[PDB]
Amino acid sequence: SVRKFTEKHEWVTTENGVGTVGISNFAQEALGDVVYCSLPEVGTKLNKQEEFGALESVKAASELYSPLSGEVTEINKALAENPGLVNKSCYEDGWLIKMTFSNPSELDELMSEEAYEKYIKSIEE
Protein backbone atom coordinates (compact mmCIF):
# COMPACT_ATOMS: atom_id res chain seq x y z
CA SER A 1 0.00 0.00 0.00
CA VAL A 2 0.65 3.80 -0.38
CA ARG A 3 -0.48 6.90 1.49
CA LYS A 4 -4.06 8.08 0.96
CA PHE A 5 -5.67 11.41 1.78
CA THR A 6 -8.97 12.95 2.77
CA GLU A 7 -10.58 16.18 1.57
CA LYS A 8 -10.12 17.55 5.09
CA HIS A 9 -6.36 17.30 4.50
CA GLU A 10 -5.71 14.20 6.60
CA TRP A 11 -3.70 11.16 5.52
CA VAL A 12 -3.68 7.48 6.38
CA THR A 13 -1.18 4.73 5.72
CA THR A 14 -2.12 1.09 6.22
CA GLU A 15 -0.32 -2.12 7.11
CA ASN A 16 -1.80 -5.43 8.34
CA GLY A 17 -5.28 -3.98 9.05
CA VAL A 18 -3.90 -1.00 11.00
CA GLY A 19 -4.14 2.60 9.83
CA THR A 20 -1.79 5.38 10.93
CA VAL A 21 -3.44 8.82 10.65
CA GLY A 22 -2.00 12.32 10.49
CA ILE A 23 -2.45 15.68 8.78
CA SER A 24 -0.96 16.73 5.46
CA ASN A 25 1.64 19.40 4.82
CA PHE A 26 -1.13 21.67 3.49
CA ALA A 27 -3.00 21.23 6.77
CA GLN A 28 -0.02 21.92 9.03
CA GLU A 29 0.83 25.05 7.02
CA ALA A 30 -2.76 26.27 7.38
CA LEU A 31 -2.62 25.84 11.18
CA GLY A 32 0.83 27.21 11.81
CA ASP A 33 2.66 26.07 14.93
CA VAL A 34 0.60 23.46 16.80
CA VAL A 35 0.40 24.25 20.53
CA TYR A 36 -1.82 21.35 21.69
CA CYS A 37 -3.10 18.02 20.38
CA SER A 38 -6.38 16.64 21.78
CA LEU A 39 -6.29 12.89 21.06
CA PRO A 40 -8.68 10.03 21.85
CA GLU A 41 -8.19 7.30 24.40
CA VAL A 42 -6.83 3.92 23.27
CA GLY A 43 -9.78 1.61 22.73
CA THR A 44 -12.10 4.32 21.42
CA LYS A 45 -14.43 3.08 18.72
CA LEU A 46 -14.68 5.35 15.68
CA ASN A 47 -16.93 5.47 12.65
CA LYS A 48 -15.58 6.92 9.40
CA GLN A 49 -16.26 10.75 9.56
CA GLU A 50 -16.56 10.74 13.29
CA GLU A 51 -14.69 13.43 15.27
CA PHE A 52 -11.71 11.97 17.11
CA GLY A 53 -9.85 15.01 18.40
CA ALA A 54 -8.52 18.43 17.54
CA LEU A 55 -5.33 20.37 16.95
CA GLU A 56 -4.81 23.86 18.39
CA SER A 57 -2.60 26.68 17.08
CA VAL A 58 -2.59 30.45 17.71
CA LYS A 59 -4.61 30.80 14.50
CA ALA A 60 -7.31 28.16 14.94
CA ALA A 61 -8.56 24.85 16.17
CA SER A 62 -8.81 22.12 13.56
CA GLU A 63 -11.21 19.27 14.26
CA LEU A 64 -9.95 15.81 13.30
CA TYR A 65 -12.33 13.39 11.56
CA SER A 66 -11.70 9.71 11.32
CA PRO A 67 -10.73 8.48 7.82
CA LEU A 68 -11.88 4.95 8.76
CA SER A 69 -14.22 2.98 10.96
CA GLY A 70 -12.47 0.91 13.64
CA GLU A 71 -10.80 1.09 17.04
CA VAL A 72 -7.96 3.33 18.29
CA THR A 73 -4.87 1.28 19.17
CA GLU A 74 -2.24 3.95 19.83
CA ILE A 75 -1.82 7.70 20.22
CA ASN A 76 1.41 9.56 19.67
CA LYS A 77 2.58 10.20 23.24
CA ALA A 78 5.34 12.57 22.04
CA LEU A 79 2.76 15.20 21.11
CA ALA A 80 1.94 16.10 24.72
CA GLU A 81 5.27 17.81 25.23
CA ASN A 82 6.26 18.26 21.58
CA PRO A 83 3.07 19.21 19.69
CA GLY A 84 5.20 20.96 17.06
CA LEU A 85 6.24 17.55 15.69
CA VAL A 86 2.99 17.85 13.69
CA ASN A 87 4.49 20.80 11.82
CA LYS A 88 8.04 19.52 11.51
CA SER A 89 7.26 15.95 10.56
CA CYS A 90 3.60 15.72 9.57
CA TYR A 91 4.03 12.48 7.60
CA GLU A 92 6.45 10.71 9.97
CA ASP A 93 7.18 11.68 13.58
CA GLY A 94 4.05 13.82 13.89
CA TRP A 95 1.52 11.05 13.25
CA LEU A 96 -1.53 11.35 15.48
CA ILE A 97 -3.24 7.99 16.03
CA LYS A 98 -3.17 4.37 14.94
CA MET A 99 -6.33 2.28 14.67
CA THR A 100 -7.51 -1.07 13.45
CA PHE A 101 -9.93 -0.56 10.59
CA SER A 102 -13.02 -2.71 10.35
CA ASN A 103 -14.27 -1.96 6.81
CA PRO A 104 -11.47 -2.17 4.17
CA SER A 105 -13.82 -0.98 1.41
CA GLU A 106 -13.56 2.45 3.01
CA LEU A 107 -10.05 2.99 1.71
CA ASP A 108 -11.37 2.90 -1.80
CA GLU A 109 -13.30 6.15 -0.91
CA LEU A 110 -10.15 8.16 -0.12
CA MET A 111 -7.98 10.15 -2.37
CA SER A 112 -4.86 8.86 -3.94
CA GLU A 113 -1.74 10.96 -3.63
CA GLU A 114 -2.21 11.96 -7.28
CA ALA A 115 -5.78 13.10 -6.67
CA TYR A 116 -4.62 15.02 -3.59
CA GLU A 117 -1.87 16.71 -5.63
CA LYS A 118 -4.51 17.82 -8.14
CA TYR A 119 -6.81 18.90 -5.30
CA ILE A 120 -4.31 21.20 -3.59
CA LYS A 121 -3.02 22.52 -6.94
CA SER A 122 -6.59 23.53 -7.81
CA ILE A 123 -7.18 25.07 -4.37
CA GLU A 124 -3.94 27.08 -4.51
CA GLU A 125 -4.46 28.37 -8.08
Instruction: Please spell the DSSP secondary structure of 70-88, one letter per residue.
Output: EEEEEE-GGGTT-TTHHHH
Nearby residues of 7 by Cβ (< 8 Å), 6 or more positions away: 111, 119
How many alpha carbons fall within 13 Å on the CB side of residue 30? 16
**Residue type present at position 89:** S
Distances (CA, A) of 16 to 36, 51, 62: 30, 24, 29
The Cα–Cα gap between 42 and 59 comes to: 28
User: Cα 76 to chain center, whole Å?
Assistant: 12
Nearby residues of 34 by Cβ (< 8 Å), 6 or more positions away: 28, 55, 56, 57, 83, 84, 86, 87
Q: Where are the domains of the chain?
A: 1-125
The answer to whether the CB of 20 falls within 8 A of the CB of 95 is: yes
Q: Which helix (H) or strand (E) holds 8?
A: none
The answer to whether the CB of 98 falls within 8 A of the CB of 20 is: yes
* DSSP string covering 100-123: EES-GGGGGGSBPHHHHHHHHHHH
Closest CA to 70 of 52, 49, 46: 46
CATH topology of domain 1-125: OB fold (Dihydrolipoamide Acetyltransferase, E2P) (2.40.50)
The Cα–Cα gap between 36 and 62 comes to: 11
The Cα–Cα gap between 24 and 119 comes to: 12
Closest CA to 35 of 86, 88, 96: 86
Q: What is the resolution of this structure in A?
A: 0.9
The Cα–Cα gap between 71 and 58 comes to: 30
